[PDB]
Short mmCIF file of C-alpha atoms and ligand atoms in Angstrom, two decimals:
data_model
loop_
_atom_site.label_atom_id
_atom_site.label_comp_id
_atom_site.label_asym_id
_atom_site.label_seq_id
_atom_site.Cartn_x
_atom_site.Cartn_y
_atom_site.Cartn_z
CA UNK A 1 137.96 89.62 118.85
CA UNK A 2 135.78 86.73 120.27
CA UNK A 3 132.09 87.71 119.70
CA UNK A 4 130.61 86.38 123.05
CA UNK A 5 132.58 89.03 125.06
CA UNK A 6 132.20 91.69 122.28
CA UNK A 7 128.49 90.69 122.40
CA UNK A 8 128.64 91.19 126.21
CA UNK A 9 130.60 94.50 125.68
CA UNK A 10 127.81 95.88 123.35
CA UNK A 11 125.00 94.57 125.69
CA UNK A 12 126.53 96.02 128.92
CA UNK A 13 127.14 99.38 127.07
CA UNK A 14 123.66 99.23 125.35
CA UNK A 15 125.20 100.35 121.98
CA UNK A 16 123.24 98.01 119.58
CA UNK A 17 121.62 101.06 117.84
CA UNK A 18 125.07 102.71 117.36
CA UNK A 19 126.74 99.54 115.85
CA UNK A 20 123.67 99.06 113.54
CA UNK A 21 123.82 102.70 112.26
CA UNK A 22 127.62 102.33 111.49
CA UNK A 23 126.74 99.29 109.24
CA UNK A 24 123.97 101.34 107.49
CA UNK A 25 126.51 104.19 106.92
CA UNK A 26 129.29 101.93 105.39
CA UNK A 27 126.93 99.69 103.28
CA UNK A 28 127.37 99.60 99.46
CA UNK A 29 125.19 101.72 97.14
CA UNK A 30 124.79 100.43 93.56
CA UNK A 31 122.19 101.30 90.90
CA UNK A 32 118.71 99.63 90.70
CA UNK A 33 117.58 101.15 87.36
CA UNK A 34 115.65 98.08 86.02
CA UNK A 35 113.60 97.83 89.34
CA UNK A 36 112.50 101.52 88.97
CA UNK A 37 111.25 101.32 85.29
CA UNK A 38 107.51 102.23 85.16
CA UNK A 39 106.61 98.82 83.50
CA UNK A 40 107.87 97.08 86.77
CA UNK A 41 105.91 99.09 89.38
CA UNK A 42 103.40 96.21 90.05
CA UNK A 43 106.38 93.68 90.35
CA UNK A 44 107.66 95.39 93.57
CA UNK A 45 105.99 94.97 96.98
CA UNK A 46 107.93 97.91 98.58
CA UNK A 47 109.08 101.13 96.81
CA UNK A 48 112.27 101.37 99.01
CA UNK A 49 113.42 97.64 98.50
CA UNK A 50 114.97 96.92 95.07
CA UNK A 51 117.55 94.46 93.73
CA UNK A 52 120.82 96.01 92.41
CA UNK A 53 121.26 95.75 88.61
CA UNK A 54 124.65 93.92 88.88
CA UNK A 55 123.25 91.01 91.08
CA UNK A 56 119.52 90.75 90.03
CA UNK A 57 118.04 87.37 88.89
CA UNK A 58 116.90 87.53 85.24
CA UNK A 59 113.84 85.55 84.06
CA UNK A 60 114.56 83.61 80.80
CA UNK A 61 111.89 85.40 78.69
CA UNK A 62 112.19 88.21 76.05
CA UNK A 63 108.95 90.05 77.11
CA UNK A 64 110.08 91.31 80.61
CA UNK A 65 112.98 89.59 82.50
CA UNK A 66 112.41 91.43 85.83
CA UNK A 67 111.79 89.91 89.31
CA UNK A 68 112.59 91.45 92.73
CA UNK A 69 115.31 88.84 93.52
CA UNK A 70 119.13 88.98 94.06
CA UNK A 71 121.99 86.37 93.92
CA UNK A 72 124.13 86.55 97.10
CA UNK A 73 127.44 84.71 96.12
CA UNK A 74 129.74 84.06 99.16
CA UNK A 75 133.20 83.22 97.60
CA UNK A 76 135.20 82.01 100.70
CA UNK A 77 132.21 80.08 102.24
CA UNK A 78 131.37 78.48 98.79
CA UNK A 79 127.59 79.15 99.31
CA UNK A 80 125.05 80.95 97.04
CA UNK A 81 121.52 82.16 98.06
CA UNK A 82 118.68 83.82 96.11
CA UNK A 83 116.90 86.39 98.36
CA UNK A 84 113.48 87.56 97.05
CA UNK A 85 110.30 89.30 98.31
CA UNK A 86 107.10 87.41 99.22
CA UNK A 87 105.35 86.82 95.86
CA UNK A 88 102.54 89.18 94.75
CA UNK A 89 99.26 88.10 93.05
CA UNK A 90 100.76 89.07 89.66
CA UNK A 91 104.30 87.59 90.33
CA UNK A 92 103.44 84.01 91.56
CA UNK A 93 104.08 82.64 88.02
CA UNK A 94 107.45 84.55 87.80
CA UNK A 95 108.48 83.12 91.23
CA UNK A 96 108.01 79.46 90.11
CA UNK A 97 109.63 80.27 86.71
CA UNK A 98 112.74 81.51 88.65
CA UNK A 99 112.77 78.32 90.88
CA UNK A 100 112.66 76.19 87.65
CA UNK A 101 115.29 78.25 85.65
CA UNK A 102 117.82 78.44 88.57
CA UNK A 103 117.48 74.64 89.39
CA UNK A 104 116.73 75.32 93.05
CA UNK A 105 115.92 72.26 95.28
CA UNK A 106 114.50 74.23 98.31
CA UNK A 107 112.29 77.29 99.07
CA UNK A 108 112.72 78.79 102.59
CA UNK A 109 109.71 80.90 103.87
CA UNK A 110 110.22 82.86 107.14
CA UNK A 111 106.79 84.63 107.34
CA UNK A 112 103.02 83.79 107.60
CA UNK A 113 100.64 84.78 104.72
CA UNK A 114 98.82 87.08 107.22
CA UNK A 115 100.68 88.97 110.03
CA UNK A 116 99.47 92.04 112.06
CA UNK A 117 96.04 91.59 110.26
CA UNK A 118 97.50 92.37 106.73
CA UNK A 119 98.60 90.14 103.80
CA UNK A 120 102.45 89.74 103.73
CA UNK A 121 102.53 87.45 100.59
CA UNK A 122 100.24 85.57 98.18
CA UNK A 123 99.01 81.97 98.87
CA UNK A 124 101.54 80.72 96.23
CA UNK A 125 101.46 76.88 96.91
CA UNK A 126 98.55 74.34 96.94
CA UNK A 127 97.02 73.44 100.35
CA UNK A 128 95.34 70.12 99.27
CA UNK A 129 96.75 67.16 97.28
CA UNK A 130 93.76 66.97 94.95
CA UNK A 131 93.65 70.78 94.14
CA UNK A 132 96.82 71.52 92.10
CA UNK A 133 97.82 75.03 90.80
CA UNK A 134 98.42 75.99 87.14
CA UNK A 135 100.21 79.27 86.11
CA UNK A 136 99.17 79.95 82.45
CA UNK A 137 101.52 83.02 82.13
CA UNK A 138 104.69 80.81 82.71
CA UNK A 139 103.16 77.42 81.63
CA UNK A 140 103.88 75.49 84.95
CA UNK A 141 101.93 73.09 87.30
CA UNK A 142 102.45 72.70 91.07
CA UNK A 143 101.02 69.79 93.21
CA UNK A 144 101.22 69.21 96.99
CA UNK A 145 102.75 65.67 97.48
CA UNK A 146 102.99 65.62 101.32
CA UNK A 147 103.04 67.89 104.41
CA UNK A 148 104.83 67.39 107.82
CA UNK A 149 103.54 69.96 110.42
CA UNK A 150 105.75 70.42 113.54
CA UNK A 151 105.57 72.92 116.44
CA UNK A 152 107.97 75.59 115.00
CA UNK A 153 108.03 74.77 111.21
CA UNK A 154 106.29 72.77 108.45
CA UNK A 155 108.09 70.84 105.62
CA UNK A 156 106.19 70.22 102.36
CA UNK A 157 107.11 68.09 99.35
CA UNK A 158 105.91 69.72 96.08
CA UNK A 159 106.04 68.59 92.44
CA UNK A 160 106.81 71.32 89.84
CA UNK A 161 106.07 70.36 86.22
CA UNK A 162 107.32 72.29 83.14
CA UNK A 163 104.12 71.91 80.99
CA UNK A 164 106.21 72.83 77.87
CA UNK A 165 108.58 69.75 78.20
CA UNK A 166 106.67 67.53 80.74
CA UNK A 167 109.82 67.38 82.95
CA UNK A 168 109.05 67.28 86.75
CA UNK A 169 111.17 68.02 89.85
CA UNK A 170 110.62 67.59 93.59
CA UNK A 171 110.87 71.01 95.46
CA UNK A 172 111.06 71.03 99.31
CA UNK A 173 109.19 73.95 101.03
CA UNK A 174 110.70 74.80 104.46
CA UNK A 175 108.21 77.07 106.30
CA UNK A 176 109.25 78.65 109.63
CA UNK A 177 105.79 79.49 111.15
CA UNK A 178 106.58 80.93 114.66
CA UNK A 179 108.60 84.17 114.12
CA UNK A 180 106.61 86.69 116.31
CA UNK A 181 104.54 89.57 114.75
CA UNK A 182 106.78 92.12 116.66
CA UNK A 183 110.50 91.86 117.65
CA UNK A 184 112.67 88.68 117.34
CA UNK A 185 112.53 85.26 119.09
CA UNK A 186 113.74 85.24 122.74
CA UNK A 187 115.89 82.07 122.15
CA UNK A 188 117.58 81.18 118.80
CA UNK A 189 117.15 77.43 119.54
CA UNK A 190 114.16 76.78 117.18
CA UNK A 191 115.64 79.01 114.36
CA UNK A 192 119.01 77.03 114.53
CA UNK A 193 117.06 73.69 114.57
CA UNK A 194 115.23 74.90 111.40
CA UNK A 195 118.52 75.93 109.67
CA UNK A 196 120.04 72.45 110.40
CA UNK A 197 116.86 70.79 108.88
CA UNK A 198 117.30 72.83 105.64
CA UNK A 199 121.04 71.85 105.50
CA UNK A 200 120.17 68.12 106.11
CA UNK A 201 117.85 68.18 103.04
CA UNK A 202 120.64 68.94 100.51
CA UNK A 203 118.88 72.26 99.56
CA UNK A 204 122.02 74.39 100.44
CA UNK A 205 124.49 72.03 98.70
CA UNK A 206 126.53 72.70 95.48
CA UNK A 207 124.92 69.84 93.50
CA UNK A 208 121.71 72.01 93.23
CA UNK A 209 121.05 75.63 92.14
CA UNK A 210 120.86 78.24 94.94
CA UNK A 211 118.15 77.97 97.61
CA UNK A 212 115.35 80.61 97.28
CA UNK A 213 114.86 82.50 100.60
CA UNK A 214 112.03 85.01 101.37
CA UNK A 215 110.05 86.84 104.04
CA UNK A 216 107.81 89.86 103.20
CA UNK A 217 110.54 92.25 101.81
CA UNK A 218 113.30 89.58 101.50
CA UNK A 219 115.92 91.56 103.57
CA UNK A 220 115.20 91.22 107.35
CA UNK A 221 114.44 87.62 108.50
CA UNK A 222 115.89 86.44 105.12
CA UNK A 223 119.13 88.35 105.97
CA UNK A 224 119.32 86.68 109.39
CA UNK A 225 119.01 83.17 107.81
CA UNK A 226 121.93 83.61 105.26
CA UNK A 227 124.22 85.60 107.69
CA UNK A 228 123.94 82.85 110.39
CA UNK A 229 124.50 79.99 107.87
CA UNK A 230 127.61 81.65 106.22
CA UNK A 231 129.17 82.65 109.60
CA UNK A 232 128.91 79.04 111.03
CA UNK A 233 130.29 77.56 107.75
CA UNK A 234 133.33 79.94 107.94
CA UNK A 235 133.97 78.91 111.62
CA UNK A 236 134.01 75.22 110.40
CA UNK A 237 136.50 76.02 107.58
CA UNK A 238 139.12 78.51 108.99
CA UNK A 239 142.14 77.61 111.24
CA UNK A 240 141.09 80.30 113.83
CA UNK A 241 137.26 80.64 114.16
CA UNK A 242 137.68 83.84 116.30
CA UNK A 243 138.88 85.62 113.06
CA UNK A 244 135.22 85.44 111.81
CA UNK A 245 133.76 88.99 111.98
CA UNK A 246 129.93 88.99 111.64
CA UNK A 247 129.80 92.76 110.83
CA UNK A 248 132.30 92.19 107.95
CA UNK A 249 130.31 89.19 106.62
CA UNK A 250 127.10 91.36 106.69
CA UNK A 251 128.82 94.22 104.73
CA UNK A 252 130.06 91.71 102.08
CA UNK A 253 126.44 90.31 101.72
CA UNK A 254 125.14 93.94 101.46
CA UNK A 255 127.23 94.34 98.27
CA UNK A 256 124.64 91.96 96.66
CA UNK A 257 121.25 93.11 98.17
CA UNK A 258 120.40 96.36 100.04
CA UNK A 259 119.08 96.53 103.62
CA UNK A 260 119.95 92.99 104.90
CA UNK A 261 119.12 93.01 108.66
CA UNK A 262 116.41 95.70 109.14
CA UNK A 263 116.73 96.53 112.93
CA UNK A 264 119.27 96.62 115.83
CA UNK A 265 117.23 93.75 117.44
CA UNK A 266 117.73 91.54 114.27
CA UNK A 267 121.53 92.33 114.44
CA UNK A 268 121.64 91.24 118.15
CA UNK A 269 119.55 88.07 117.37
CA UNK A 270 122.05 87.22 114.50
CA UNK A 271 124.98 87.39 117.00
CA UNK A 272 123.01 85.18 119.49
CA UNK A 273 122.22 82.56 116.80
CA UNK A 274 125.90 82.32 115.61
CA UNK A 275 127.28 82.18 119.23
CA UNK A 276 124.82 79.46 120.39
CA UNK A 277 125.17 77.61 117.05
CA UNK A 278 128.99 77.74 117.51
CA UNK A 279 128.82 76.63 121.22
CA UNK A 280 126.50 73.63 120.34
CA UNK A 281 128.99 72.45 117.58
CA UNK A 282 132.26 73.57 119.36
CA UNK A 283 131.97 71.04 122.26
CA UNK A 284 129.24 71.32 124.99
N1 LIG B 1 95.23 76.95 89.85
C1 LIG B 1 95.42 78.33 89.81
O1 LIG B 1 95.17 78.92 88.77
N2 LIG B 1 95.90 78.96 90.97
O2 LIG B 1 96.13 80.33 90.99
C2 LIG B 1 97.55 80.54 91.36
C3 LIG B 1 97.70 81.87 92.10
C4 LIG B 1 97.63 83.09 91.42
C5 LIG B 1 97.76 84.31 92.12
C6 LIG B 1 97.94 84.33 93.52
C7 LIG B 1 97.99 83.10 94.22
C8 LIG B 1 97.88 81.89 93.51
N1 LIG B 2 106.17 83.36 79.56
C1 LIG B 2 107.34 82.61 79.27
O1 LIG B 2 107.79 82.58 78.12
N2 LIG B 2 107.95 81.92 80.31
O2 LIG B 2 109.09 81.18 80.04
C2 LIG B 2 109.50 80.53 81.29
C3 LIG B 2 109.20 79.06 81.23
C4 LIG B 2 107.90 78.58 81.18
C5 LIG B 2 107.64 77.20 81.13
C6 LIG B 2 108.70 76.29 81.13
C7 LIG B 2 110.01 76.77 81.17
C8 LIG B 2 110.25 78.14 81.23
N1 LIG B 3 133.90 70.64 115.43
C1 LIG B 3 135.20 71.24 115.52
O1 LIG B 3 135.63 71.87 114.55
N2 LIG B 3 135.92 71.08 116.75
O2 LIG B 3 137.19 71.62 116.93
C2 LIG B 3 137.07 73.05 117.30
C3 LIG B 3 136.85 73.23 118.84
C4 LIG B 3 135.71 72.71 119.52
C5 LIG B 3 135.54 72.90 120.91
C6 LIG B 3 136.49 73.62 121.66
C7 LIG B 3 137.62 74.14 120.99
C8 LIG B 3 137.80 73.95 119.61
#
């Protein structure tokens, strides 16, 4: 069924809350035993948001391999994403270790450091060229190379150096700075523009490791970003783009990380983004 009219059928009936609860009811439940070990309590921002054991990213160290991060592998779309929480004061070194070990080209950030007067994640990247960051616990160095500030997002070029080998890589930081403190954007125009800028960079492409995507918990805004991208890629690839069922793509993604799309408003916004993104590509 074409999703514009279905969209219109849910909107006219006002059943967004009822669709969203059906998804929550059918979603996968797998164990998260490593996340709940007592040694890992200060590595988790939220007690109710954990990576599943089968899909968690492992750090390449013998001490403690745990980070709150999951690999979302979409087989038919041929895309992979790492979804993770906003780094904590004691996990900033782990975060950059993961970016290095997984060979990521891009980091996508969908939140501000402060929202609603509270800290949503650590200041994990340098703000001035001449004041670089060193993480002694994971032996890495991070330098701001350049910054391009626009109205809805900022793009930064960073240099990440493995102090053990003296190898360096360029990491692109894509920071969406205008998601509102409450609710979802009114138009998906600036979110779709942002997504097309990340694609243009090469960050989502198979010649690199998976892109790292985060918000505060790494399930709501982060969920919206990977659901919209995968759905539009499938519409490009299949003979009949109407076959593409956003609710079925979301349930497949929820086999890899719990809780993706946190509210009925985020579900409606996801539909809007895919429809408009489809209409802008599919002709007019
Ligand atoms: N140069 C340097 O040591 N920077 O500290 C990095 C850092 C640690 C914890 C939270 C945010 C940033
Ligand atoms: N603590 C620890 O052993 N971390 O290993 C990760 C790491 C660090 C530097 C360069 C490459 C990998
Ligand atoms: N880009 C692309 O895949 N175009 O062909 C699909 C299409 C576009 C507009 C109207 C109907 C079908």
